[PDB]
RNA sequence: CACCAUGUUCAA
RNA sequence: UGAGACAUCUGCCUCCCACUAGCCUGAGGCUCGCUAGGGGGCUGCUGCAUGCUCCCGAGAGCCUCCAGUUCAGCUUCUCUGAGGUGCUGUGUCCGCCACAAAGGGCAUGCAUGCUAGAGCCAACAGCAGGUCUGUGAUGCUCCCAGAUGUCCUGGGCCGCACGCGCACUACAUUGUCACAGUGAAGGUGUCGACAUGCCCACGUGGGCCCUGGCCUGAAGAGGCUGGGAAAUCCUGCAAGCCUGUGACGUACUGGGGAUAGAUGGUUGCAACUGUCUGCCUUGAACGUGGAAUGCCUAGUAUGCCUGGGUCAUCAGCCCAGACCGAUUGUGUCCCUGCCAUUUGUACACACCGC
């Protein structure tokens, strides 16, 4: 039928030792941490991303500013 | 915890002929499989005790062996039968789960029961026509303007 | 110190119960928990391996704040939009076995009773559960 | 003394208040422990037909309405007592209904 | 650069479709005067509303 | 003893009718027994406590608000209940207390939001035939 | 007595509108909510006295399926001035003001004879908050960069100008346009 | 627009001509004195005319109205 | 002041 | 005559009204509790704060045809017959051929001020507009027993190389799924035509409409037992959108759900050309759409569901209902047209003319 009328992202599923490092060190330095920019900076998938930022908040190296089902707002602990 | 990823992760495994992405999740991989489907992958992740948690390619071959098994006859690992994908089955009157092209298998089987009788549906089939009474009148159009 | 149902959020408080239940080991639960959806309409099974604890701490609450609630009532509350296909979405009640499922096994543990003319009612011990749990909801420090 | 209940119902809001007005008169003539016209929710009976007797033109609806007006009277009397003061004569389109127990 | 400038009487519609105004603006300053000219205005304009006109030089004739 | 000095007042806004009664207590403000820090939706539950914000509990720390709500929506309801409570304080304080109290209450919620204690008239249009809503017609088809 | 604030977080009255020609048109009156629904549309001007932050609501429910959904544009709003306090260190309300008063177009071209001509201060801030929230709208879509990311972001730069904000790389080519047509 | 009709005109002269001397310049109370002069079906057209009779009123206090004869 | 041609026969 | 006036509805208020609404009191019952708070003062490091200390007061959430103060508990909500109420109110500015108004725009007050909103009704002339298939409305005309009457069985109206109108669903992260929460309004409902029947029960009762509660089932659904000719029962219809959390992570993808396969109910005398529907499976196009074009000005557009009509079963339709709720404009005669005056005309079937 007569039609009228973006590379693609390969994100890593599963973590590897240099992103998850960096994201050890880094990233608990950015002043806006959210599932996007993990996942834009390291290349990692965004359910990777959720899983990050809900570790490294649990173990103290972020916190929360404004979290919910939208943009999910962390920020380097200090 | 962040676990990394294993070195023997396999990009796309093959699960009882059929190629599965390791990058998904098992229960969202073992939908490649044709026959299997979103519900009956997410009961047999269940039943294989395999978590659904990890992706697919962490699977190992005792993972997947034990999970063909359930995809394979799935009546012995507690899957009720009405969960299944033959319920009744004429010509053999039993209740399997049609899984990587015994799917299309049976049903080209369905087909040449239907059509070697001269039964409506069958026909329709044949003629190349929509089954189970849609009106063919604007809708199946596909191309061709004259 | 004083705390009551209708004081907590119902989420967080029925994210208790169903811890309460758990932990307990009380219910009795069936052998088609993993297999079954929650509706007619449900796309997916519940996903969370507790949803039958979540759900019985829903049903308890409900029990609370309504009392008389019967069946077909909480058929009417879990139920949902239906998912047909290119047609609209109509209102259709959810699945009534699990329901009873878990007021039986309610009203074995000794929480609800079906009440004189109709449907489930709260328990005096019930009540007290639930009105422990809400003061460890609210107040979880002395809880 | 007996307990009574007098149901007035009528498509006609005048004929109605007419008539339960006369019946509270009656009531009080030789008071009888009335308690007035309790004023039950009018039922609007809404029939949206096509105009057209064939499908031609744009599509328009006559939409005719039906109200039904309906009160309540308690009371605290005897049999015959009540029978007369609902027997002195009601206006018309008006149905009147006397339960006791 | 805008030189910001104030509107003094709404002279009134004008644009094919009626959707420009035609409103004399004085040419309100940090202590400057003595000089209106007439300019065209897109969108609601109701009165002592300082424009910002990128250009000063060029007027609209009036209509 | 319970004297009981009592105001009850309303609020609406399109179908929602929250009727509170504006005890003499110590601090209790309540819709349907839930407080008001616990009703949906959450972002707006700065909405339904606007009105105690602009008074502030200086204000309230005496009365005792209790909020019966029914009909409309989740907006409609908080505004309706919002609306009740600014209308049963200045009626409380019209009644119970100093006149120039009561329009100080009153001139402060009136320089902010006027539909705190007047009611909004709008309600919906009725629907027309010949199109789908009070505005909307059909789709106009020439050859 | 005690003046309210945004979301009991910023406050609607230490914001400076630098621009003489937006000052009465960009408006200031503290509330404790953007979703105030005081029926703004009655009179021809009326819609410049609700606050700003309450204009932007609604641009953002826009298209087809997000229409009238003033309960989830609220909490877009907060995440997006949350982002924007962290990031820029000003007042959220203040650098939106700032953004406004920067993508708002001065000249736009009508039919009079295609010729240039002057905006007013009022569709100034209409433009402004519709480049924002409609630019913002474009780069959320198909990306995993989530609404109040983009919101924020994009009014960052339009409030640093930053010539890569769908609202000012607009307003930009209008005013070329125009001047153009001068 | 708000232009009234010869029904609410004509009647509001012809009650200032025959009581002039009991109406005023208030708008609330020439409604109570048309209220219990004229015989009006409607509300609606009471309060019409017994606003043109204000106005009219009003004009007269100001000065000379052309088109009604007070006869005193 | 771009360009804007046409409308079978009788009947009304 | 028409317009207006009028009539209905929404919006504010009074009266009337209450064991079909709600609330209070009383009496019975529960469950949590006898903290915290407030007013302070001192206290530290004007100011700000932290502790300490004194005084004052234990209450919350519910259940019940239980009744109750002239032998009348009350009317804030709720129901409603009548009636109030706004008249463009007030201020300012503008407003004719000398003068003079009708009136209009802003601002403000009001429950409110585009004719208050929305509708209903709507004159005179017509169209050779639709309907003889709505009628025991009907003229002429045709058929009239091998019927164009009528009934019965089956089929067809749905049949598919294609063109179109229109609507529903989408193309996703302002999102899909999963769990949970909050939470409407209009209404309809049991032969008074059917039944002058069919079924269970026992020569006779009950059922047929809307359905509660209980039980079985994974669902669809089925049994038992009750209510309602209804503000009384379904029903406070616990509507969906929405909100909270979790999963997904930009991939025709957990978007989309068309197509198709095995087979379990239900309605019906009858389900094949699948009535609807359960369960597993199958997983199409579609990555915002060329020329072109519709509707729309505030509780409006849009979204989202609900009731009623049709209906033994079938709603993606229509007529209404609420719910969430705006962006712009407050003009113009440019486009498409309408009304009026002037003017021309070789038109009058009237420019689709001649």
Redesign the pocket.
Known sequence: ???????????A?MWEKVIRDKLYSEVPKYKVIT??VI?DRLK????????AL?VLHAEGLIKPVN??????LYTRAT | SLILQPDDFQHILRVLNTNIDG???V???L?????????????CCKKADID??R?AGTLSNDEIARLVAIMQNPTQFKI???????????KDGK?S???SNV??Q??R???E??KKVR???????M???????????????????? | ???????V????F??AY?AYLKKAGKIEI???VD??????????????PD?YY??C???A?????????????????????????????????????????C??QL?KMGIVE????????????G??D???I??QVL?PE?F | ?H?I?I?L?SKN??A??KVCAELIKGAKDH?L????????????????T????????T?????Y?M?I????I?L?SPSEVVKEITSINIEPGVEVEVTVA | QPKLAQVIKII????????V?QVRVKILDDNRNDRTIIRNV??????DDILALMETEREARRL | ??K?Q?????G????????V?C?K????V?????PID???????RLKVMEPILIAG??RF??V?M?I????????????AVRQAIAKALVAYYQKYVDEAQKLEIKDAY?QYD?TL??????????????????????????? | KTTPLLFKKWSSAEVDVNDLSLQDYISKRSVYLP???Q?????????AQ?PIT??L????????????????????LKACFEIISLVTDQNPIQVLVDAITKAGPREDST?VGRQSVDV?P??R???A??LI??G???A????????????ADEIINASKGSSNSYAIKKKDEIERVAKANR | ?????????RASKVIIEKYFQKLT????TN??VI?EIAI?????????????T???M??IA??????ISLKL
């Open positions: 039928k007569k039609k009228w009328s973006r590379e693609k992202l390969h994100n599923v599932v996007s996942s990692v998938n965004g359910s990777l991303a959720r899983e809900k979290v919910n089902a939208n943009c999910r | 990058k998904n999740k229960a969202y991989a939908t490649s499989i044709k026959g299997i489907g979103r519900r009956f992958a997410i009961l659904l948690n992706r009720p039968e009405w969960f299944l994908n033959r319920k009744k089955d004429p209740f789960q049609s899984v799917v299309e049976k049903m089987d369905d087909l029961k239907l039964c409506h549906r069958g026909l329709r089939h003629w190349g026509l929509r089954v189970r009474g849609q009106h063919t009148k604007t809708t199946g159009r596909r191309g061709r303007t004259v | 110190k004083p705390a009551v149902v209708k004081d959020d119902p989420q967080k029925i994210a169903a069936p052998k088609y297999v079954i959806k929650l509706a007619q309409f449900k796309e997916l099974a519940p996903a969370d949803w979540t759900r701490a829903a049903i609450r409900r029990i609370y704040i309504n009392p008389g609630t019967g069946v077909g009532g909480f058929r009417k509350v879990f139920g949902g939009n239906d998912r047909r296909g290119v047609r609209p979405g109509r209102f259709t009640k959810s699945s009534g076995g699990i329901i009873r499922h007021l039986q009203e079906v009440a004189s003319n109709g449907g489930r009612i709260m328990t005096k011990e009540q007290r639930l009105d422990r809400a003061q107040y002395m | 003394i307990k209940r149901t119902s809001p005048k109605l208040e008071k422990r009335v308690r007035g016209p309790v004023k039950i929710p009018t039922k609007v009976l809404r029939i949206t096509r105009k057209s007797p064939c499908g031609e033109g599509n328009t609806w006559d939409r309405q109200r007006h309906k009160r309540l308690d605290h | 009134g519609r004008t644009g094919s479709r009626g959707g105004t897109k969108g609601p304009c109701r009165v | 003893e319970s009981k009592k105001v009850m007042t309303f609406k806004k399109k179908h929602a009718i929250a009727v009664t005890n207590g110590k601090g209790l309540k819709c349907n027994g839930v616990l009703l949906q939706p959450e972002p707006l509990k200086h720390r005496n005792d209790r019966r709500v029914r009909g409309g929506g989740q907006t409609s309801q908080l505004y009136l006027r204690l007047v009611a909004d008239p709008r309600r919906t249009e009725p629907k027309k035939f010949g199109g789908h809503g009070a505005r909307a017609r059909r789709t106009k088809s020439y050859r | 979703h105030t629904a029926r703004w549309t009655k009179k021809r001007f009326r819609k609700c309450e204009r609501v609604n641009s953002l429910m826009y298209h087809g399926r997000n229409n009238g959904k003033k309960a989830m544009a609220v909490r877009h039919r007013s009022l569709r801030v209409n433009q908050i519709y929230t409609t913002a709208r474009e959320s879509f198909r990306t995993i960069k989530t609404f109040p990311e983009c919101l | 627009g708000r232009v009234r009709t010869k029904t609410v005109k310049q208030d708008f609330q409604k109570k209220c009006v079906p409607s509300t609606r057209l009471r309060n019409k005319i017994a606003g043109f204000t106005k009219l009003k004009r100001r000065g000379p109205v052309r088109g």
